[PDB]
């Protein structure tokens, strides 16, 4: 609390390329001063939601570790990123625990990701045999097997690739736009306090 030792949490909110939802990114914060006032007062953050800690008293309690999770999803299932619900992405790509604490952030990317040619690099998973435990990645791309028949890696019919591509273009409207999502989580009561905000008077 000087402030000079600001951890680089600006680029986790503003970078070149966000990771896809199936291969989302995690960043670890240590020995820093946590000033969220520059982000709360900033304009274009469309969604600011959390459950465990207060939305405005987040500088008055002091933590030990901070994990910043970043990915990009379609605009509708920003409703679905909250813990409890199911379906696509919540079960097959990213699941939050029922006792989750931390704040989720969502904003639009109208003029930063849409391309007239069509962008297909952002993938999502549609076919998983098991269910995702909370905070778990899945990078394996072996083809789904459906009950029986010898397509167990032959990649033919009655067997579908799990990683499909989004539909991302100026002709699209609200609901199909790319929303950047970053989730700030934290853990407590195992170490001396390292990261938390400055002192005012």
């Amino acid at each position: 609390p000087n402030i000079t030792n600001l951890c680089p949490f600006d680029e986790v909110f503003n970078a070149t390329r966000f990771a896809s939802v199936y291969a989302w990114n995690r960043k670890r914060i240590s020995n820093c001063v946590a000033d969220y006032s520059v982000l709360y007062n900033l304009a274009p953050f469309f969604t600011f939601k959390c459950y465990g800690v207060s939305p405005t008293k987040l500088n008055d309690l002091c933590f030990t570790n901070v994990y910043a999770d970043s990915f990009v999803i379609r605009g509708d299932e920003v409703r679905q990123i909250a813990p409890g619900q199911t379906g696509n992405i919540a079960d097959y790509n990213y699941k939050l625990p029922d006792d989750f604490t931390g704040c989720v952030i969502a904003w639009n990317s109208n003029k930063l990701d849409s391309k007239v040619s069509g962008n297909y690099n952002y993938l999502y998973r549609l076919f998983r045999k098991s269910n995702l435990k909370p905070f778990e990645r899945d990078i394996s791309t072996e083809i789904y097997q459906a009950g029986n028949k010898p397509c167990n890696g032959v990649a033919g019919f009655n067997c579908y690739f799990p990683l499909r591509s989004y539909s991302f273009r100026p002709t699209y409207g609200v609901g199909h736009q790319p929303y950047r999502v970053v989730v700030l989580s934290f853990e407590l009561l195992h170490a001396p306090a390292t990261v938390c905000g400055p002192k005012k008077s």
């Epitope: 390329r17 966000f18 995690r26 394996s140 791309t141 170490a191």
Partner: antibody, heavy 125, light 107 residues
Framework: EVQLVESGGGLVKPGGSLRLSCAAS????????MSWVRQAPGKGLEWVGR??????????DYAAPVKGRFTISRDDSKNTLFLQMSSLKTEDTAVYYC??????????????????WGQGTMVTV | ELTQDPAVSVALGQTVRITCQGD??????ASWYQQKPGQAPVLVIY???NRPSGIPDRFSGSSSGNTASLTITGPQAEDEADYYC???????????FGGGTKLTVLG
């Protein structure tokens, strides 16, 4: 199914250079925190280095006893992970593995739990 | 630097307890790998208390402060192997590894 294949290694005079290649299949290589690890015959496993992912900044680290003299690299087009060894010492006779940190794990931390390993190659200096 | 005993002698059908000593195990929870004779190491336990799928429900993990431990309930004749614990250091974020331990069959 998902596979890592190691290639390279042999007998070489000390002070030379040698390049070890790891080829991966079955998973998205561009978002994997791969690593190199070594083991002397009859001894425990010894870390060599990390390479990390470009989505999050290339932060390729190294182990303390072999810092600097080894070069690590990634190429996503040819699906290759490269380890270059120069200025060799007499203690480098070991088996080498390329190991993916994350395939099916729960993290809570930095994404490293060493899920799937490789068949590993000889090197004798 | 982690610490392990060279070998543990437990008879068949009895719970086997494997230890790992380290100063920085309060954070950076250890992971346990098993090495067969002349084979690549395989994952056994990682994370808080869970294991990868396909591993039989015989290995469990526990941690208390500066101590880490693995528990085997009802060992068979195929568990004669080496066990390695893994943690991280606070500063450099390296995987450091440990000395390992050996487990044999006393039938």
């Amino acid at each position: 199914e998902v596979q890592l294949v190691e290639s390279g290694g042999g007998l070489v005079k000390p002070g030379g250079s040698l390049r070890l290649s790891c080829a991966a299949s079955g998973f998205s290589f561009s978002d994997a925190w791969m690593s190199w690890v070594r083991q002397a015959p009859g001894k425990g496993l010894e870390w060599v280095g990390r390479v990390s992912s470009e989505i999050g900044g290339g932060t390729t680290d190294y182990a303390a006893p072999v810092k600097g003299r080894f070069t690590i690299s990634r190429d996503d087009s040819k699906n290759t992970l490269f380890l270059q060894m120069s200025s060799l010492k007499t203690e480098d006779t070991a088996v080498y593995y390329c190991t993916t940190g994350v395939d099916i794990v729960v993290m809570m931390y930095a994404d490293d739990a060493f899920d799937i390993w490789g068949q590993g190659t000889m090197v004798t200096v | 630097e982690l610490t392990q005993d060279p070998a543990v002698s437990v008879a068949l059908g009895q719970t086997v307890r494997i230890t790992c000593q380290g100063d920085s195990l309060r954070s950076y929870y250890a992971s346990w790998y098993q090495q067969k004779p002349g084979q690549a190491p395989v994952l056994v336990i990682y994370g808080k208390n869970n294991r990868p799928s396909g591993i039989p429900d015989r290995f469990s993990g526990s941690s208390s402060g500066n101590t880490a431990s693995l528990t085997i309930t009802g060992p068979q004749a195929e568990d004669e192997a080496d066990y390695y614990c893994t943690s991280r250091d606070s500063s450099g974020n390296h995987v450091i590894f440990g000395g390992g331990t050996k487990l044999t069959v006393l039938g």
